[PDB]
Structure formats: structure tokens, C-alpha cells
Amino acid sequence: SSPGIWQLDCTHLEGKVILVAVHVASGYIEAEVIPAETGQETAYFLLKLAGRWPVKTVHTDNGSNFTGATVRAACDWAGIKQESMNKELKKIIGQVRDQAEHLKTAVQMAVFIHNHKRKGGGYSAGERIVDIIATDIQ
Amino acid sequence: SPGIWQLDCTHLEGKVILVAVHVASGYIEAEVIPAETGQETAYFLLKLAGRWPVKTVHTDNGSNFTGATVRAACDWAGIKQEMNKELKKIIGQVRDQAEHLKTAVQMAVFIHNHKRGYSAGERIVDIIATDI
Amino acid sequence: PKIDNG
Amino acid sequence: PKIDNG
Ligand SMILES: [Cl-]
Ligand SMILES: [Cl-]
């Protein structure tokens, strides 16, 4: 079921690693700066995601941080199947970067802006994700 | 009221956990943070505000709220300033499964939000989708 | 000076 | 031996 499908990618800025989870059906994003592109940090990020939204499947790039035990254990535990927006996000980060000392803050401002922007009766990604999930429950 | 959250701190193993509760549903977001400072508090609120439509946050109005940083983040995000025992129980039930407290906290949030005739996670999206 | 700080 | 590590 497509309300439950997410795509996870990494992106890199200032020598730091940003994980970006996109809810495929809405375009809603969750992203954060993480210390290193490791299985442990990747598993943590997914555990957090899975507690907030009803995550069924997460499509990943299948690289090094996914070959070990830790992401597999977290996805097993949480019941997750492992079966342009990077550029968009970076564009927004660049507009706000001088407003924050730390990149991590700029990233969360950029998530805010991405999720809440109304491009029109046209909804934001934040509104789209809730409407899609609410529809699937009732 | 769909936009109202409550933010409280709780302490375990010498670490600080911030807990945001969506008052109308009981849905929670929580994380271990390095220190109960304005800067870490503001970061947490900025993250929350990007994920949900946050209009009002009720806080304990303590030391981490007197400075410039939380005020600057809430201004920016358009937030007006105006469960711990449950979470800690769940944390204790899963703690031996994780080396690090932070992981146990996120397993506990998962359990809290998904336990079920709706779960808190279902209740929050229904409330917000009704308001839109 | 910036959002997350002075 | 745990979820996030050993
Ligand atoms: Cl990745
Ligand atoms: Cl607090």
C-alpha cells in the first residue's frame, strides 16, 4: 500500500551527511544531518521515522550502510520491508544558510519551508500526507 | 484544537529527554538531547514545526525559555508560546534491547504511537485532516 | 547573531 | 548483541 511507501536517500553539503526520507505519494520530507553514513545512524533515523508515520516499505540506495546487521534489525523490529528533491532541498538550504550558524538548523528550516509551501486551493506536502493517510484509515 | 502541543522535559540515566505531546490525540514526539539549553530546545521545536502544523506550544516557561533562541525559532516558525510516566515505563520495557538510551526512547515512541480502536498516530492524522 | 545563536 | 550495536 502506497500510503506506506517512502524513499530514503543521502545528500552531502559542507562535508556533512544529510539523510532525506520522502513520502512518495505526497512529496512530504523528513531530513536530518547525521554524524556519519553508517548502519547505526541510518537505523536510528529509520526508527524515528517509523514512530511518527505508518511506514510499510522504504526504498533505499542499497549501499554500504545497508549491508550490516543494524538497519536490518531496526526494519525487522519496526515491520518495515526493504523492497531532484535533494536538489530542491539544497536550493532551500542555500536561501536560509546565513540565517543559522549551524547547517543542521538550516536543514530543518528548509524542511519547514518545503513541507509548508503552498504553490497555489492547492495544498502543501504536509497537508497532502495527512489527507492521504487519513483516507487510507477511514 | 489541532495546532496545540505541550512540551515537557523528563530525565533518565543522567540524560535529558524532551517530549512533545499533541494535546487532542495523545501522539508524542520525543528525543534525547545533549543538554536542556535554549539552543537545543529551539532545534527540537524547529523540527517539530516542520512536520506538523504547530500553532501553539505550552512549555514549562523555565530557564531554557528566557533567552533569545527559542523565542527566535518560535517567531520564525509562527508558533505562539502560551505522558512522562507512561513513556518511562515503556522505555524500561525495551531498554535491555538497545545499548543506547536514545534508541530505547525512539522504540518507546513507536510503541506509544502505534499501540491500539485507533492508535495515537491514527488519531492525530484524522484530527488534522478533519481541520484542513 | 544568527537564528540558533547570538 | 543488542538492536543498535552488539
Ligand atoms: Cl543512504
Ligand atoms: Cl523543557
Three-state secondary structure readout of A75-101: HHHHCCECCCHHHHHHHHHHHHHHHCC
Q: Tell if the CB–CB gap between C3 and B72 is shorter than 8 Å.
A: yes
Query: Is residue B24 exposed (0-12), middle (13-18) or buried (19+ Cβ within 10 Å)?
Result: middle
What end-to-end distance do the CA atoms of chain C give, in Å? Answer: 4
Task: Name chain B's partners: 3 or more CB pairs within 8 A.
Answer: A, C, D
Q: Cell triple for residue A67?
A: 549491508
* CA-wise closest residue to A21 among A13, A31, A11, A12: A31
Q: How far apart are CA A117 and CA A126, in angstroms?
A: 9
Entry resolution (Å):
1.7
Q: How far apart are CA C3 and CA B42, in angstroms?
A: 9
**What HEC string does B65-127 produce?**
HCCCHHHHHHHHHCCEECCHHHHHHHHHHHHHHCCCHHHHHHHHHHHHHHCCCCCHHHHHHHH
Nearest bound ligand to the CA of residue A36:
1
Element of type H or E holding B131: helix B120-131
User: For residue A16, what are the contacts with CB-CB under 8 A and spacing of at least 6?
Assistant: A33, A103
CB atoms within 10 A of CB A9: 15
Amino acid making up residue A113: I
| Angstroms from B5 CA to nearest CA on chain D | 30
Residues belonging to the binding site of A for Mg(2+) are 9, 61
Asked if A11 contacts A86 with a C-beta cutoff of 8 angstroms, the reply is: yes
Q: How many angstroms is it from B74 CA to the middle of ligand 2?
A: 14
CA dist B69 → A100, B48, C1 (Å): 11, 16, 10
Q: How many angstroms is it from B62 CA to the middle of ligand 2?
A: 7
Q: Does D3 touch chain B (CB under 8 A)?
A: yes
> Is B75 marked as a binding-site residue?
no
**What HEC string does B22-55 produce?**
ECCCCCEEEEEECCCCHHHHHHHHHHHHHHCCCC
Q: How many angstroms is it from A125 CA to the middle of ligand 1?
A: 22
The chain D residue lying nearest A44, using CA atoms, is D4
B16 has which bridge partners?
B11, B33
Q: Cell triple for residue A91?
A: 536550493
* CA-wise closest residue to A56 among A131, A6, A11, A103: A6
Q: How many angstroms is it from A64 CA to the middle of ligand 1?
A: 8
Q: What are phi and psi of A18, to 5 degrees?
A: -115, 125
Q: How far apart are CA A113 and CA A70, in angstroms?
A: 32
Asked if A22 contacts A29 with a C-beta cutoff of 8 angstroms, the reply is: yes
**Residue in the block written with cell 539523510:** A19
Q: What are phi and psi of A130, to 5 degrees?
A: -65, -45
A122 alpha-carbon distance from chain centroid: 22
* CA-wise closest residue to A17 among A29, A32, A2, A5: A32
DSSP chain A: -GGGEEEEEEEEETTEEEEEEEETTT--EEEEEESSS-HHHHHHHHHHHHHHS---EEE----GGGSSSHHHHHHHHHT-B---HHHHHHHHHHHHGGG-SSHHHHHHHHHHHHHH-----PPPHHHHHHHHHHHHH-
Domains in chain A: how many in total? 1
Return the SS3 of B5.
strand
Radius of gyration of chain A, Cα coordinates, nearest whole angstrom: 15
Which residue among A98, A101, A109 sits closest to C5, beta carbon to beta carbon? A101
Between helices A103-116 and B38-51, what is the axis angle to 10°? 30
Query: Is residue B48 exposed (0-12), middle (13-18) or buried (19+ Cβ within 10 Å)?
Result: buried
CB atoms within 10 A of CB B31: 19
Q: Which domain holds residue B7?
A: 1-132
Angle at CA of residue A78, ends A28 and A9, nearest 5°: 40
Give the DSSP letter of residue C6: -
| Angstroms from D4 CA to nearest CA on chain A | 6
Q: Tell if the CB–CB gap between A77 and D5 is shorter than 8 Å.
A: no
Structure method: X-ray
Nearest bound ligand to the CA of residue B84:
2
Angle at CA of residue B115, ends B45 and B35, nearest 5°: 30
Element of type H or E holding B1: none
Q: What pairing do the DSSP bridges indicate for beta strands B80-81 and B56-58?
A: parallel
Q: How far apart are CA A128 and CA A107, in angstroms?
A: 21
Asked if A35 contacts B94 with a C-beta cutoff of 8 angstroms, the reply is: no
C-alpha torsion angle, residues B76, A29, B54, C1 (rounded to 10): -20
Q: Tell if the CB–CB gap between B76 and C4 is shorter than 8 Å.
A: no
The chain C residue lying nearest A101, using CA atoms, is C2
> Is B131 marked as a binding-site residue?
no
CATH number of the CATH domain containing B20: 3.30.420.10
* CA-wise closest residue to A127 among B130, B43, B57, B27: B130
Q: How far apart are CA B105 and CA A123, in angstroms?
A: 33
